Amino acid sequence: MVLMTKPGTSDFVWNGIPLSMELNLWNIKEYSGSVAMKFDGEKITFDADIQNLSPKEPERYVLGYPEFYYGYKPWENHTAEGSKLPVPVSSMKSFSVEVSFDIHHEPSLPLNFAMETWLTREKYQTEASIGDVCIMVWFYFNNLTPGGEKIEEFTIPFVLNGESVEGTWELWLAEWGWDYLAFRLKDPVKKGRVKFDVRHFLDAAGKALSSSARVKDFEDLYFTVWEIGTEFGSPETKSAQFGWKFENFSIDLEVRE
Ligand SMILES: OC[C@H]1O[C@@H](O[C@H]2[C@H](O)[C@@H](O)[C@@H](O)O[C@@H]2CO)[C@H](O)[C@@H](O)[C@@H]1O
Ligand SMILES: OC[C@H]1O[C@@H](O)[C@H](O)[C@@H](O)[C@@H]1O
Protein backbone atom coordinates (compact mmCIF):
# COMPACT_ATOMS: atom_id res chain seq x y z
CA MET A 1 0.00 0.00 0.00
CA VAL A 2 1.28 3.44 -1.15
CA LEU A 3 -0.02 6.91 -0.24
CA MET A 4 0.84 10.37 -1.47
CA THR A 5 -0.79 13.66 -0.55
CA LYS A 6 1.43 16.10 -2.29
CA PRO A 7 3.04 16.12 -5.72
CA GLY A 8 5.70 13.48 -6.19
CA THR A 9 6.37 10.03 -7.57
CA SER A 10 6.16 6.57 -5.86
CA ASP A 11 6.84 3.11 -7.23
CA PHE A 12 4.58 0.14 -6.65
CA VAL A 13 3.91 -3.32 -7.97
CA TRP A 14 0.46 -4.34 -9.14
CA ASN A 15 -0.42 -7.94 -10.02
CA GLY A 16 3.35 -8.46 -10.52
CA ILE A 17 3.78 -5.39 -12.78
CA PRO A 18 6.32 -2.75 -11.63
CA LEU A 19 4.65 0.70 -11.94
CA SER A 20 5.05 4.35 -10.91
CA MET A 21 2.30 6.54 -9.49
CA GLU A 22 2.69 10.31 -9.94
CA LEU A 23 0.44 12.85 -8.13
CA ASN A 24 1.17 15.09 -11.06
CA LEU A 25 0.17 18.78 -10.77
CA TRP A 26 2.84 19.82 -13.24
CA ASN A 27 1.32 23.10 -14.39
CA ILE A 28 0.02 24.38 -11.05
CA LYS A 29 1.98 27.28 -9.45
CA GLU A 30 0.11 26.99 -6.18
CA TYR A 31 -3.01 25.37 -4.71
CA SER A 32 -4.64 24.91 -1.35
CA GLY A 33 -6.91 22.12 -0.19
CA SER A 34 -6.35 18.37 -0.46
CA VAL A 35 -5.15 15.74 -2.92
CA ALA A 36 -4.66 12.04 -2.18
CA MET A 37 -3.55 9.11 -4.28
CA LYS A 38 -3.29 5.65 -2.96
CA PHE A 39 -2.51 2.15 -4.12
CA ASP A 40 -3.83 -0.61 -1.81
CA GLY A 41 -2.60 -3.71 -3.63
CA GLU A 42 -5.79 -4.04 -5.68
CA LYS A 43 -6.78 -0.55 -6.87
CA ILE A 44 -5.35 2.94 -7.38
CA THR A 45 -7.64 5.84 -6.39
CA PHE A 46 -7.25 9.55 -6.64
CA ASP A 47 -9.27 12.35 -5.02
CA ALA A 48 -8.83 16.08 -5.27
CA ASP A 49 -10.66 19.01 -3.63
CA ILE A 50 -8.33 21.93 -4.36
CA GLN A 51 -8.78 25.67 -4.67
CA ASN A 52 -6.74 28.88 -5.08
CA LEU A 53 -5.38 27.47 -8.32
CA SER A 54 -3.05 29.39 -10.69
CA PRO A 55 -1.00 27.91 -13.56
CA LYS A 56 2.80 28.04 -13.99
CA GLU A 57 2.42 28.54 -17.77
CA PRO A 58 -1.12 29.60 -18.86
CA GLU A 59 -0.14 28.76 -22.44
CA ARG A 60 -0.09 24.99 -21.64
CA TYR A 61 -3.79 25.18 -20.81
CA VAL A 62 -4.31 22.16 -18.51
CA LEU A 63 -3.20 22.24 -14.83
CA GLY A 64 -2.18 18.64 -14.08
CA TYR A 65 -2.27 14.94 -14.96
CA PRO A 66 -2.52 12.62 -11.88
CA GLU A 67 -1.51 9.27 -13.23
CA PHE A 68 0.36 5.97 -12.99
CA TYR A 69 2.65 4.47 -15.62
CA TYR A 70 4.66 1.51 -16.86
CA GLY A 71 8.17 2.31 -18.09
CA TYR A 72 10.45 5.37 -18.20
CA LYS A 73 8.82 8.82 -18.10
CA PRO A 74 11.35 11.15 -19.76
CA TRP A 75 10.30 14.28 -18.00
CA GLU A 76 10.94 12.90 -14.60
CA ASN A 77 14.03 10.85 -15.50
CA HIS A 78 12.20 8.00 -13.81
CA THR A 79 11.43 4.30 -14.03
CA ALA A 80 10.46 1.63 -11.50
CA GLU A 81 12.70 -1.47 -11.42
CA GLY A 82 11.88 -4.35 -13.81
CA SER A 83 10.07 -2.76 -16.80
CA LYS A 84 10.70 -4.00 -20.39
CA LEU A 85 10.38 -0.34 -21.58
CA PRO A 86 11.81 1.64 -23.28
CA VAL A 87 12.03 -0.38 -26.52
CA PRO A 88 12.25 0.74 -30.16
CA VAL A 89 8.76 1.13 -31.72
CA SER A 90 9.95 -1.45 -34.27
CA SER A 91 10.50 -3.96 -31.43
CA MET A 92 6.84 -3.90 -30.41
CA LYS A 93 4.81 -6.66 -32.04
CA SER A 94 1.79 -5.92 -29.81
CA PHE A 95 1.17 -4.06 -26.58
CA SER A 96 -2.09 -4.96 -24.95
CA VAL A 97 -3.42 -2.78 -22.13
CA GLU A 98 -6.45 -3.50 -20.03
CA VAL A 99 -8.00 -1.49 -17.21
CA SER A 100 -11.34 -0.84 -15.40
CA PHE A 101 -11.98 2.80 -14.53
CA ASP A 102 -14.55 5.00 -12.80
CA ILE A 103 -14.12 8.78 -13.21
CA HIS A 104 -16.18 11.42 -11.42
CA HIS A 105 -15.91 15.23 -11.47
CA GLU A 106 -17.81 18.46 -10.78
CA PRO A 107 -19.67 19.17 -14.03
CA SER A 108 -17.94 22.19 -15.39
CA LEU A 109 -14.36 21.07 -14.87
CA PRO A 110 -12.32 20.58 -18.04
CA LEU A 111 -10.98 17.04 -17.75
CA ASN A 112 -10.13 13.89 -19.66
CA PHE A 113 -9.25 10.27 -19.05
CA ALA A 114 -6.25 9.78 -21.32
CA MET A 115 -3.42 7.46 -21.79
CA GLU A 116 -0.16 8.40 -23.41
CA THR A 117 3.39 7.61 -24.50
CA TRP A 118 6.47 9.61 -25.42
CA LEU A 119 8.35 8.36 -28.49
CA THR A 120 11.91 9.71 -28.33
CA ARG A 121 15.06 9.61 -30.53
CA GLU A 122 17.37 8.56 -27.70
CA LYS A 123 16.39 5.92 -25.12
CA TYR A 124 16.63 8.03 -21.93
CA GLN A 125 16.00 11.70 -22.75
CA THR A 126 14.86 14.01 -19.91
CA GLU A 127 12.68 16.00 -22.31
CA ALA A 128 10.90 15.83 -25.65
CA SER A 129 11.80 18.21 -28.53
CA ILE A 130 11.65 18.39 -32.35
CA GLY A 131 11.75 14.91 -33.81
CA ASP A 132 9.97 13.39 -30.75
CA VAL A 133 6.27 12.52 -30.42
CA CYS A 134 3.61 12.43 -27.71
CA ILE A 135 0.73 10.09 -28.57
CA MET A 136 -2.43 10.22 -26.36
CA VAL A 137 -5.54 8.06 -26.38
CA TRP A 138 -8.59 9.78 -24.82
CA PHE A 139 -11.38 7.43 -23.61
CA TYR A 140 -13.29 10.33 -21.95
CA PHE A 141 -13.51 14.05 -21.85
CA ASN A 142 -15.60 16.77 -20.32
CA ASN A 143 -15.43 20.40 -21.40
CA LEU A 144 -12.00 19.81 -22.95
CA THR A 145 -10.70 19.53 -26.51
CA PRO A 146 -7.33 18.07 -27.52
CA GLY A 147 -4.65 20.49 -28.61
CA GLY A 148 -3.85 21.21 -32.25
CA GLU A 149 -6.34 20.64 -35.01
CA LYS A 150 -8.58 17.71 -35.82
CA ILE A 151 -7.05 16.23 -38.98
CA GLU A 152 -8.94 12.96 -39.42
CA GLU A 153 -10.84 10.01 -37.99
CA PHE A 154 -9.74 6.35 -37.70
CA THR A 155 -11.82 3.22 -36.95
CA ILE A 156 -9.82 1.27 -34.40
CA PRO A 157 -11.13 -1.78 -32.50
CA PHE A 158 -11.22 -2.26 -28.77
CA VAL A 159 -12.94 -4.39 -26.17
CA LEU A 160 -15.43 -2.29 -24.19
CA ASN A 161 -16.84 -4.08 -21.12
CA GLY A 162 -16.14 -7.48 -22.65
CA GLU A 163 -17.44 -6.67 -26.12
CA SER A 164 -15.42 -6.10 -29.28
CA VAL A 165 -16.50 -2.82 -30.77
CA GLU A 166 -15.15 -0.66 -33.54
CA GLY A 167 -14.46 2.75 -32.05
CA THR A 168 -14.34 5.97 -34.02
CA TRP A 169 -11.27 8.02 -33.01
CA GLU A 170 -10.65 11.64 -33.88
CA LEU A 171 -6.99 12.43 -34.54
CA TRP A 172 -5.88 15.83 -33.37
CA LEU A 173 -2.41 16.95 -34.31
CA ALA A 174 -0.31 19.84 -32.98
CA GLU A 175 3.17 20.75 -34.00
CA TRP A 176 4.61 22.37 -30.92
CA GLY A 177 7.99 21.84 -29.28
CA TRP A 178 7.49 18.20 -30.29
CA ASP A 179 4.72 16.59 -32.18
CA TYR A 180 1.50 15.99 -30.27
CA LEU A 181 -0.98 13.43 -31.59
CA ALA A 182 -4.15 12.77 -29.65
CA PHE A 183 -6.70 10.08 -30.65
CA ARG A 184 -10.01 10.91 -28.98
CA LEU A 185 -12.84 8.36 -28.81
CA LYS A 186 -15.97 10.01 -30.21
CA ASP A 187 -18.26 8.15 -27.80
CA PRO A 188 -16.59 9.04 -24.53
CA VAL A 189 -16.90 6.56 -21.70
CA LYS A 190 -16.80 7.75 -18.05
CA LYS A 191 -16.81 4.36 -16.44
CA GLY A 192 -16.15 0.92 -17.79
CA ARG A 193 -13.53 -1.58 -18.76
CA VAL A 194 -11.35 -1.37 -21.81
CA LYS A 195 -8.81 -3.68 -23.47
CA PHE A 196 -6.89 -2.66 -26.55
CA ASP A 197 -3.65 -2.92 -28.53
CA VAL A 198 -1.50 0.19 -28.50
CA ARG A 199 0.08 -1.13 -31.71
CA HIS A 200 -3.02 0.03 -33.63
CA PHE A 201 -2.45 3.60 -32.47
CA LEU A 202 1.20 3.42 -33.24
CA ASP A 203 0.40 2.21 -36.76
CA ALA A 204 -2.08 5.02 -37.25
CA ALA A 205 0.33 7.65 -35.88
CA GLY A 206 3.08 6.25 -38.10
CA LYS A 207 0.97 6.79 -41.25
CA ALA A 208 -0.12 10.31 -40.18
CA LEU A 209 3.48 11.16 -39.66
CA SER A 210 4.83 9.46 -42.81
CA SER A 211 5.34 12.77 -44.70
CA SER A 212 6.48 14.75 -41.70
CA ALA A 213 9.46 17.01 -41.93
CA ARG A 214 10.00 17.11 -38.15
CA VAL A 215 9.52 13.45 -37.30
CA LYS A 216 11.52 10.91 -39.28
CA ASP A 217 12.20 7.20 -38.90
CA PHE A 218 9.10 6.74 -36.74
CA GLU A 219 9.71 3.01 -36.11
CA ASP A 220 13.20 3.76 -34.85
CA LEU A 221 11.92 5.94 -32.02
CA TYR A 222 11.95 4.58 -28.41
CA PHE A 223 8.47 3.87 -26.96
CA THR A 224 9.42 4.94 -23.44
CA VAL A 225 6.36 4.58 -21.29
CA TRP A 226 2.63 4.02 -21.07
CA GLU A 227 0.85 6.59 -18.84
CA ILE A 228 -2.75 6.36 -17.71
CA GLY A 229 -4.36 9.33 -15.98
CA THR A 230 -6.68 12.32 -16.13
CA GLU A 231 -5.65 15.76 -17.39
CA PHE A 232 -7.70 18.57 -15.84
CA GLY A 233 -8.13 22.30 -15.73
CA SER A 234 -7.79 25.38 -17.89
CA PRO A 235 -5.85 28.65 -17.49
CA GLU A 236 -8.86 30.23 -15.72
CA THR A 237 -9.87 27.39 -13.33
CA LYS A 238 -9.53 28.44 -9.70
CA SER A 239 -10.72 25.18 -8.10
CA ALA A 240 -11.14 21.48 -8.97
CA GLN A 241 -13.03 18.61 -7.44
CA PHE A 242 -12.78 15.21 -9.04
CA GLY A 243 -11.39 11.71 -8.45
CA TRP A 244 -11.11 8.28 -9.94
CA LYS A 245 -10.50 4.63 -9.37
CA PHE A 246 -8.65 2.17 -11.72
CA GLU A 247 -8.75 -1.59 -11.19
CA ASN A 248 -8.34 -4.87 -13.12
CA PHE A 249 -5.05 -3.76 -14.63
CA SER A 250 -2.83 -5.89 -16.89
CA ILE A 251 -0.51 -5.24 -19.82
CA ASP A 252 1.34 -7.49 -22.22
CA LEU A 253 4.21 -6.21 -24.32
CA GLU A 254 5.30 -8.70 -27.02
CA VAL A 255 8.88 -8.03 -28.20
CA ARG A 256 10.18 -9.06 -31.64
CA GLU A 257 13.59 -8.48 -33.36
O1 LIG B 1 5.89 19.84 -20.67
C1 LIG B 1 6.48 19.00 -19.69
C2 LIG B 1 5.37 18.33 -18.88
O2 LIG B 1 4.52 17.57 -19.76
C3 LIG B 1 3.49 16.86 -19.07
O3 LIG B 1 2.72 16.07 -19.99
C4 LIG B 1 1.69 16.78 -20.70
C5 LIG B 1 2.18 17.22 -22.08
O4 LIG B 1 3.14 18.27 -21.94
C6 LIG B 1 1.01 17.74 -22.92
O5 LIG B 1 1.50 18.04 -24.24
C7 LIG B 1 -0.07 16.66 -23.04
O6 LIG B 1 0.47 15.51 -23.68
O7 LIG B 1 -0.53 16.31 -21.72
C8 LIG B 1 0.51 15.82 -20.85
C9 LIG B 1 -0.13 15.63 -19.48
O8 LIG B 1 -0.77 16.86 -19.12
C10 LIG B 1 4.13 15.89 -18.07
O9 LIG B 1 3.11 15.11 -17.43
C11 LIG B 1 4.97 16.65 -17.04
O10 LIG B 1 5.62 15.71 -16.16
C12 LIG B 1 6.02 17.46 -17.79
O11 LIG B 1 6.70 18.34 -16.89
O1 LIG C 1 -0.28 20.98 -22.49
C1 LIG C 1 -1.06 21.23 -23.67
C2 LIG C 1 -2.52 20.76 -23.49
O2 LIG C 1 -3.27 21.29 -24.60
C3 LIG C 1 -4.67 21.04 -24.43
O3 LIG C 1 -5.37 21.73 -25.41
C4 LIG C 1 -4.96 19.54 -24.52
O4 LIG C 1 -6.34 19.31 -24.27
C5 LIG C 1 -4.11 18.72 -23.53
O5 LIG C 1 -4.09 17.33 -23.91
C6 LIG C 1 -2.66 19.22 -23.47
O6 LIG C 1 -2.08 18.73 -22.28
User: How far do the termini sit from each other?
Assistant: 37 Å
Strand content: over 45%
Query: Biggest β-sheet, characterized?
Result: 18 strands, mixed
Structural class: mainly beta
Helicity, in percent?
under 10%
List the ligand species: a molecule of 2 linked components (GLC-BGC), beta-D-glucopyranose
Instruction: Tell me the name of the CATH homologous superfamily.
Output: Glycoside hydrolase family 11/12, catalytic domain
Number of domains: 1
Q: What is the H/E string?
A: EEEEEEEEEEEEEEEHEEE
CATH architecture: Sandwich
Approximate shape: globular
| Total beta strand runs | 18
Q: Kindly provide the radius of gyration, computed on alpha-carbon positions and rounded to a whole number of angstroms.
A: 17 Å
CATH class: Mainly Beta
CATH topology descriptor: Jelly Rolls
Q: What does this 3D model show about the protein?
A:
The protein is mainly beta and 257 residues long. It has a single domain, classed as Sandwich (Jelly Rolls), CATH 2.60.120.180. Helices cover 4% and strands 58% of the residues. The chain has one helix spanning 198-208; strands spanning 2-4, 8-14, 17-23, 28-39, 44-55, 67-73, 78-79, 87-88, 92-105, 111-120, 133-142, 149-160, 163-175, 179-185, 191-197, 222-223, 225-229, 240-255. Strand 6 and strand 7 (78-79) form a beta hairpin. The longest helix is centred in the C-terminal third of the chain and has 11 residues, at 198-208. Residues 24, 26, 62, 65, 75-76, 116, 134, 136, 180, 231 line the site of a molecule of 2 linked components (GLC-BGC). Keywords: Carbohydrate metabolism, Glycosidase, Hydrolase, Polysaccharide degradation.
